[PDB]
């Protein structure tokens, strides 16, 4: 009775979740080094909904894509424009938002 | 020592294979009905490398995308342009290529 594509979408969705939950389990906790900046950071999560194509707001509100950010700042051309972002959450970020989240590219990050 | 994106690609690849091998197991063997043509066919495989955006060659060699095919022939607008194709292989196709493979869209196919 059902549409093949709908059946396929449901199987896809279960497998996507498995993959994302497998990556996070494996990566969350580790520290990475930037080849250009040689600075270290802990991986606290993965933003599966963000990509280097996306923009972030600077201090005065100016928007820049991560592609434009890495090219203008380091002379780095990001090859994989569809990769997710690695999140590093700071230790004094809210009260009852006091600090923003740090965002690294898997392409420029090295395990250890 | 490794790049996070490379590690992620390897996990992605294992999960993609699992998904594709799960879909094929579930679908191969079943017969589907086209809402526009009301004709039936057995699913013999799934072409994961083809999409409705892709083209097929007609008898005299004229190329047409499946998008243009369904719109010009049935007045059907294909909504999901990234879906794979369902394969139906015929029973007198080669000797020692005598017949081509049949190709259906999951979006226009109904299980039974």
UniProtKB/Swiss-Prot annotation, chains A, B:
User: What residue range is the signal peptide?
Assistant: none
Per UniProt, subcellular location reads as: Cytoplasm
PTM (free text): Arginine methylation by PRMT5 is required for the interaction with Tudor domain-containing protein TDRD1 and subsequent localization to the meiotic nuage, also named P granule.
What tissue specificity is annotated for this entry? Expressed in adult testis and in most tumors.
Domain PAZ positions: 3-112
Q: Which family does it belong to?
A: Belongs to the argonaute family. Piwi subfamily.
UniProt function note: Endoribonuclease that plays a central role during spermatogenesis by repressing transposable elements and preventing their mobilization, which is essential for the germline integrity. Plays an essential role in meiotic differentiation of spermatocytes, germ cell differentiation and in self-renewal of spermatogonial stem cells. Acts via the piRNA metabolic process, which mediates the repression of transposable elements during meiosis by forming complexes composed of piRNAs and Piwi proteins and govern the methylation and subsequent repression of transposons.
Assembly and binders: Interacts with DDX4, MAEL, EIF3A, EIF4E, EIF4G, PRMT5 and WDR77. Associates with EIF4E- and EIF4G-containing m7G cap-binding complexes. Interacts (when methylated on arginine residues) with TDRD1 and TDRKH/TDRD2. Interacts with TDRD12. Component of the PET complex, at least composed of EXD1, PIWIL2, TDRD12 and piRNAs. Interacts with MOV10L1. Interacts with GPAT2. Interacts with TEX19. Interacts with GSK3B. Interacts (via PIWI domain) with BMAL1 and CLOCK. Interacts with TEX15.
The protein here is known as Piwi-like protein 2
The organism named in the record is: Homo sapiens (Human)
Q: Which gene encodes it?
A: PIWIL2
Which residues of the intact protein are shown? 387 to 501 of 973
